[PDB]
Amino acid sequence: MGLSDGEWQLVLNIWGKVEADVAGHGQDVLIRLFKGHPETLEKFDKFKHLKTEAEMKASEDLKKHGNTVLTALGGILKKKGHHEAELKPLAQSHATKHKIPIKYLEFISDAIIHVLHSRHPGDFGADAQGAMNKALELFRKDIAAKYKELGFQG
Numbered sequence: 001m002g003l004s005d006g007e008w009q010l011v012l013n014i015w016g017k018v019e020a021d022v023a024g025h026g027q028d029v030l031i032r033l034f035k036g037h038p039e040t041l042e043k044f045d046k047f048k049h050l051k052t053e054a055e056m057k058a059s060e061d062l063k064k065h066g067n068t069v070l071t072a073l074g075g076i077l078k079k080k081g082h083h084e085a086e087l088k089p090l091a092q093s094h095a096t097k098h099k100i101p102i103k104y105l106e107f108i109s110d111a112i113i114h115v116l117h118s119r120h121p122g123d124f125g126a127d128a129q130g131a132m133n134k135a136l137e138l139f140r141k142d143i144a145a146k147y148k149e150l151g152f153q154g
């Protein structure tokens with residue numbers, strides 16, 4: 001499931017573009033996630049009134065969440081697979097406190113890739129697409145294993 005050094009370089013180069021506007025990218029990720037998979041939105045009582053894309057884009061609170069999520073994921077990606085320390089608290093909260101179904105991590109991975117195509121079509125070529133897919137697959141695989149270790153089957 002690992003990535004080569006070259007693959008990690010493609011991942012971190014496109015992530016570098018995300019880092020120019022972490023909150024905005026993160027907002028767009030959550031908009032894609034919530035619109036495409038409304039069951040995910042249901043996990044956020046505070047966002048229940050957000051129905052349209054425009055309403056979601058207008059929400060500074062959703063933007064803050066976008067920043068939270070992509071800040072943590074960026075920290076994980078920069079470790080190039082050596083992310084035990086970063087993954088531990090995230091698995092613990094999402095498995096045992098928030099109880100977020102493991103499938104939703106696939107949905108958010110898809111959403112990240114959608115946003116990268118949307119914002120960076122010139123710089124997100126097929127090699128970067130493949131490498132980013134591998135990186136998100138590794139993250140998902142590792143956090144799914146932790147979910148089970150923690151006793152969360154959802």
Ligand code: HEM
Binds near residue numbers: 041089094098
């Ligand atoms: C790339 C995947 C994700 C990352 C990096 C991520 C990151 C985080 C971080 C850093 C926090 C705050 C600290 C904590 O409680 O752990 C958090 C809180 C939370 N996350 Fe996630 N998250 C991810 C995916 C999801 C998904 C897919 C959902 C639900 C659909 C979700 C639901 C929550 C909820 C309900 C909270 C508590 C919200 C609050 O009370 O403010 N997360 N997330």
